[PDB]
Amino acid sequence: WTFGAGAALQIPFAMQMAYRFNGIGVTQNVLYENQKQIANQFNKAISQ
Amino acid sequence: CDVVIGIINNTV
């Protein structure tokens, strides 16, 4: 997560969204209850 | 407990 002021700290990037659920202010039960669906929406979005 | 990847028991 920490980058810029820092170097990197090994976060596996679903954990990035799990922390970024705060920059909207929501649970981590967004993603992990909806893992592959949110993944595929990201994929379909990029494909479109 | 369904999508829990790393599992830690005995939370008191």
Side-chain angles (χ1 to χ4, degrees), chain A residues 29 32-33 35, chain B residues 2-5:
Chain A
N29 278 312
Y32 303 104
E33 295 177 353
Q35 190 83 41
Chain B
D2 291 330
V3 295
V4 179
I5 298 172

Side-chain angles (χ1 to χ4, degrees), chain A residues 18 20-30:
Chain A
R20 278 175 171 270
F21 284 146
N22 297 312
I24 179 174
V26 305
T27 177
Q28 297 167 357
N29 278 312
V30 170

Side-chain angles (χ1 to χ4, degrees), chain B:
Chain B
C1 187
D2 291 330
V3 295
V4 179
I5 298 172
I7 294 169
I8 297 171
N9 286 314
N10 63 23
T11 297
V12 302

